[PDB]
Design an enzyme around this catalytic site. Sequence first.
Site, mmCIF file in Angstrom:
data_model
loop_
_atom_site.group_PDB
_atom_site.id
_atom_site.type_symbol
_atom_site.label_atom_id
_atom_site.label_comp_id
_atom_site.label_asym_id
_atom_site.label_seq_id
_atom_site.Cartn_x
_atom_site.Cartn_y
_atom_site.Cartn_z
ATOM 1 N N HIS A 40 -4.489 3.432 1.107
ATOM 2 C CA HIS A 40 -4.603 3.371 -0.434
ATOM 3 C C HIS A 40 -4.502 2.036 -0.897
ATOM 4 C CE1 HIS A 40 -0.223 3.133 0.234
ATOM 5 N NE2 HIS A 40 -0.055 2.185 -0.817
ATOM 6 N N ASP A 84 -3.077 7.391 5.912
ATOM 7 C CA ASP A 84 -2.877 6.370 5.159
ATOM 8 C C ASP A 84 -2.920 5.191 5.749
ATOM 9 O OD1 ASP A 84 -2.864 5.050 2.674
ATOM 10 O OD2 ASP A 84 -0.643 5.162 2.313
ATOM 11 N N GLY A 175 4.051 -2.477 -3.944
ATOM 12 C CA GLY A 175 3.767 -3.874 -3.576
ATOM 13 C C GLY A 175 4.178 -3.997 -1.917
ATOM 14 N N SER A 177 3.420 -1.547 -0.094
ATOM 15 C CA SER A 177 2.339 -0.682 0.678
ATOM 16 C C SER A 177 1.561 -1.484 1.571
ATOM 17 C CB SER A 177 1.325 -0.156 -0.293
ATOM 18 O OG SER A 177 1.909 0.956 -0.707
ATOM 19 N N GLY A 178 1.029 -0.740 2.760
ATOM 20 C CA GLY A 178 0.104 -1.322 3.628
ATOM 21 C C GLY A 178 1.000 -2.154 4.744
#
Lengths: 223, 8
Positions: A40, A84, A175, A177-178
Site C-alpha cells: 500500500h 501487503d 507513516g 507503514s512498510g
Amino acid sequence: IVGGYTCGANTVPYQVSLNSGYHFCGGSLINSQWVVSAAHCYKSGIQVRLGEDNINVVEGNEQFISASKSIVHPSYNSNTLNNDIMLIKLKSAASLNSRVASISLPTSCASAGTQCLISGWGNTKSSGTSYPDVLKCLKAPILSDSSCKSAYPGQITSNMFCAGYLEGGKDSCQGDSGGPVVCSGKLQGIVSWGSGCAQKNKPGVYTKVCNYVSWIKQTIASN
Amino acid sequence: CTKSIPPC
Ligand SMILES: [Ca+2]
C-alpha cells in the site's frame, strides 16, 4: 510509532524511509539493492532514504536512492490488505555500512510472543498527529493468531499478524507503514494496518513476511 | 487504516 522511543541514530540500519518529497512509508533494506515495504505504500516517485535518522535534516549517513522498481505483490488486495508487501529495487545498490545494513529475511515464521522491533517515522500520537524527526522504535510482541483474529475478526489473513499491545498506547502508526517488524534479527513483519493506532484492543497488523520469503527471493532473483 | 501517509 506511538508509545515507542527514539531508536537512536542508525540503530535500525535496515530501516528506510520512502520519500516522495516527504516521508510516507518505511521499508526495510533486505540487500543492497532491495527494500521490502508495504504494497500500500506503492507509488511512483519513490526515493528510498537509507541511513536516516532525522528525516528532516541531512545529518550524514543518508543515502537517497531512487526506486527503480516498485513491485507490489501481484496478489495485493488493497481492500483487505492481504499480501501487503512490495519490493523496491534501488536504482543503484546502497552502500552498506554500519548505518545502512540489510536485515535478514525470516527462515521461518515467528511465534506468538516473540518480541520484535518495529520502527518508523510514523505518527507518534494515538490521537492527532505528530510526525517525528527521528526514527522511533517500539518493542512489540507478536500476538497470537487468536488474539489477532479476535481484535480484527474476518480481517486477518494468513499473511498478517498482529503485534503490539492490546492495552493501548504502543503501536505503529501512520507513516510507519512498510517499515520493519524485526524479530530475532529477522524481518518478520511489515507495518501494514490497524484500527487507528495504539488503540486498546486494536493492535497493529503486519504483513507476515515469512510467507513471502520465497516470493521475495524469486522476485529479486528475476529483477 | 493502513499506516501510510496518508492512511488508506
Ligand atoms: Ca536525515
